[PDB]
Amino acid sequence: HRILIERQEKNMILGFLPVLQWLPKYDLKKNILGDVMSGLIVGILLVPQSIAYSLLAGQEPVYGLYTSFFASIIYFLLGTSRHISVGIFGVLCLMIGETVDRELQKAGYCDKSCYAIMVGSTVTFIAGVYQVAMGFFQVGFVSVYLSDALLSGFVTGASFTILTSQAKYLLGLNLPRTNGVGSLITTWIHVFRNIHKTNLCDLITSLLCLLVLLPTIELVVVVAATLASHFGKLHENYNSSIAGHIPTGFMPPKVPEWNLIPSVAVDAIAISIIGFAITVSLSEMFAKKHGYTVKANQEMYAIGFCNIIPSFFHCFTTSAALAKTLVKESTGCHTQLSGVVTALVLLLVLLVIAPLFYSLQKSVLGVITIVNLRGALRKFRDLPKMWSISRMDTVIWFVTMLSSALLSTEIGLLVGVCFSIFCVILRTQKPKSSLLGLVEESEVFESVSAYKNLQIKPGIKIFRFVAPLYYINKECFKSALYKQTVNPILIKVAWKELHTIVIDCSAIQFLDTAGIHTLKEVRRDYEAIGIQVLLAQCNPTVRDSLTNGEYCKKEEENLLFYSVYEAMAFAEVSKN
Amino acid sequence: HRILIERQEKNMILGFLPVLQWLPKYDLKKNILGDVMSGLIVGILLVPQSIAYSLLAGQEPVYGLYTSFFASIIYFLLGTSRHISVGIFGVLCLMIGETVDRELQKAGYCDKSCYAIMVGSTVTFIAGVYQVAMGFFQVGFVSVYLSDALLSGFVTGASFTILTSQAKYLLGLNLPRTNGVGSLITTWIHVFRNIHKTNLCDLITSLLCLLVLLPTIELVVVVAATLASHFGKLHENYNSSIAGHIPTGFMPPKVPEWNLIPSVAVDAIAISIIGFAITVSLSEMFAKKHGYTVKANQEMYAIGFCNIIPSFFHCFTTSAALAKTLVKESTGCHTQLSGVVTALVLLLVLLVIAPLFYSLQKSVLGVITIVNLRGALRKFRDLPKMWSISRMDTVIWFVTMLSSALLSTEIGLLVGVCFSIFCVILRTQKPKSSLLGLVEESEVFESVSAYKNLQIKPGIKIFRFVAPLYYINKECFKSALYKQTVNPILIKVAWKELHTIVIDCSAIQFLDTAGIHTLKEVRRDYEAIGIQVLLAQCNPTVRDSLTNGEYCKKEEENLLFYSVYEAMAFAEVSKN
Ligand SMILES: O=C([O-])C(=O)[O-]
Ligand SMILES: O=C([O-])C(=O)[O-]
């Protein structure tokens, strides 16, 4: 009556540049509206964003505009997604500024501003080739190790570090630069220490900008603030911080200095990883939004060469925002030509009307940065909902947040990745394990601890262990099996109803050397007392591992079964 | 015809000192033989072992004897296992010497020998309190993270570092001390560089000792070597290395200097972990050998206080050997009183007949250390057998070996622990997934890729995914499900036989937020084409996660089933 089942016998140019085949398919009438509106809006919007993040990264306004313009042009010539906005990312520029400050401290501070670019571009050039190499060799699976609950706590914690850093500009204080682990608390300490020396004009204008922009517009706010700062001596009479002169034109291209490659490679690893994890994602999510497909390898290449050709022209790393991909969505663009228009607008700003924002203050720039972190720092209102869905994901999110906001961004990403992997390990150990009962008028065996009125038979116990059996939870497996049924060691040492134990191995995913040893020891110990142990519903991998580990002899039979019902039927017959 | 199952409603002194109750139960006639033989043999055997490992740890002979004697006495007064030998461990002394050398270099070299003890005892005192604290708070589960394939590659790699270090003494060379990552290759480089300056007498005696001891005795070899070295001017005429004067008596107890606590704590973590992992183990394995039980918490306490009271008297860390637990096994001791005799013998050596080994050379000590690493360095002959049982365990063992033998011992244990956890992660990702077929004249569904003649029905496909569904393997789950059956995205974008898909969730252990989202997306995408997706055999945890994640509405039914047979039956009826 045993179940008998037999085992089975033991186009390169076209791909590189999407626009080669995308231009003929593009229709001017189909994609006309939104492209013109996006170019001026997104472009005028990326001017403040650029001047600010450049100061966040440790540079001047000109280089932020360089990065944005070159990123847009390169992605248009190389990208595949029809809705993504490749430009400056706040978190990436924060990490760039951290590395730039570290190397500046190492060197000691070719002006100091010039040396920032050499470090800044070199980090980006290494980040780009890392993205190119991992894309070419098809080693892009490393994205699977960064979840959406770690890459949403890293961006909610790094948003506090960007708002703390900007708190200097909002309050009009010339605070010293703070770096390393614990920079957030130290900067706040300096803020409260020097709060008496805050500029009255800077505080007034920052309060007005916060009270206007937050309820609400960004472009008109920038225009109004610049106009108010102009036609006045507040740069001297009020001694308020001013953006200053923005150099015009394009400087000659400079090859990144290869003297700094070994120092900047380690940070470039994190830069490239987050840059492709946060792009290939919002490029796939938006592709699913509009019902089209995006090539992950082509995104790899596009975001890789977006950090090399710009890197030759004094630019830092570029990545998709999803904080300005929404501005261009609201615009209504239906093609990547809009970005070109944006680039054109940036070009129209880069050499022409460049000193028009000379009088623009820094407090307004900080306020603009503040009213754009709203999204990430509002992820707090979703905490109870996250707790309801999954408590461990909530814990991982909070740990990543606290680590990134208090122990540097890079250490706060490595703490997130490792903690998530250990949380999976923690889920494996101390797992669910319970007896099973028979469902009346059926052949289904379910947990007698989760379902009621489950019929069980005296003398036979069915034990289910959900997790895989390996070195981590072998002791837990033995302890649970002994807590249920009987403890063979205790009965043997005491000697010196129950007669059959069935283990349901359906949920066991794999077996380690310790797991094979644990199963053999369990069977031998129970057989010493006079109990027979039958394994049921072992997957083919577990069956092969047991056969390789010599759990049973070839001549021996009546030991492994394909179903719990078959094992129960065999045990009842043997007792008779 | 659906299965309807209802869910269930939502003695302190006696324990501290085993000898209080073990002495009255002890019988002199029952445990008489072996105790006397062990004391002299194990004791005379622990004299060379002590003088050598002390030089391995960076100290003089007197302190090794201190450590061995005090460890034996303390474990007799506190230990529970009746067969374990608590004394000096080669790997532990190697790590102690590494930390001692690091602090010696930091300070710069109270004689230099005296400062070694202050660092040596302080490391041990912190290691002991860590074992005491983790035992008292019942946080001893940390042992589960060190497998028997990592703690057997760490001890096979650290055995090469001990044999390389001893290669200096075998060849009679005064090589400089090498430390840090890559010390093994550097020391071998120095050996080959200075091979021309090797002592002829030291080489001759080391070759003779190697050719005699290895085929075979250790005690008589020590006696013969000491006698040959005595009554001769080879210490001067041949300029051979000599152990030297061993101080007699007991020095006054010295409290460990608390100035070095923060520097030595990090190494003390590894010292305490390996010390209790390699003891509670060979104390449980030997207990199972002789059919008795050992209290893990009492072992925690005994091995913890074995590193505190000795630590007050110029002693370093103590741990069970299982390299001299076999010598005392062969003796035939049946109680812990034998260790006391050993301690007595050590005492008889510590103040009396101490200069009897003054003329003993160091080459013979190195040879004795060499012919005792045989066990760990013979674990190479078991490599093919390990490969047959489990390839991943073999890879973990080799990686731990290479890391410990080439990148320091502590880094080689942390590399082993992390790689094993990632190997479990690697086992989860890229897992097994295949279609299932129906077994004829039964109700068992098995893989159609592993079993032959499995009947399947057109229009209905049963898909099994072995691993848990979470952020790491969500993309793999979607890709596998699309490779089998049909790819809903491609059919939808093309439009712009198969009609039912059953997913067997029996092997799925848990579901992450990404897993719940992946399942919902899969169901929606297939329902768009016109395919119905039914989940079957979901464990109660997965069912609760789906209910919490709002996978199905309360009013909605015919979506989750308790068995694949029930799901198949329902699908056939619906098609009719
Ligand atoms: O969730 C994400 O990936 C993010 O926001 O960066
Ligand atoms: O396997 C072990 O635990 C050892 O030998 O240390």
Residue numbers in the entry:
A (entry chain B), B (entry chain A): 52 to 61, 87 to 185, 212 to 318, 335 to 614, 645 to 724
What do the paper's sentences say?
We determined the structure of SLC26A2-C2O42− without NaCl to an overall resolution of ~3 Å. Surprisingly, we found no experimental density for C2O42− in the canonical substrate-binding pocket between TM3 and TM10. Instead, we found weak densities outside the pocket, in the core and gate domains interface between TM5 and TM12, which could accommodate a C2O42− molecule. Our model shows that the C2O42− substrate is likely stabilized via interactions with the side chains of adjacent Ser residues, as well as backbone carbonyls from L253. We mutated the Ser residues and carried out the cellular transport assay. The result shows a ~ 40% reduction in transport efficiency, confirming the importance of these Ser residues for C2O42− translocation. In addition, we performed molecular dynamics simulations to probe the dynamics between SLC26A2 and the C2O42−. The result showed that C2O42− remains bound for ~65 ± 4 % of the time. Notably, in all simulations, the C2O42− molecule does not enter the exact binding pocket that accommodates Cl− and SO42−, implying that the substrates’ transport pathways might not be exactly the same.
Each protomer of SLC26A2 can be divided into three regions: the N-terminal region (residues 1–104) comprising a few flexible cytosolic helices and loops, the transmembrane domain (TMD, residues 105–540) with 14 transmembrane helices (TMs), and the C-terminal cytosolic sulfate transporter and anti-sigma factor antagonist domain (STAS, residues 541–739).
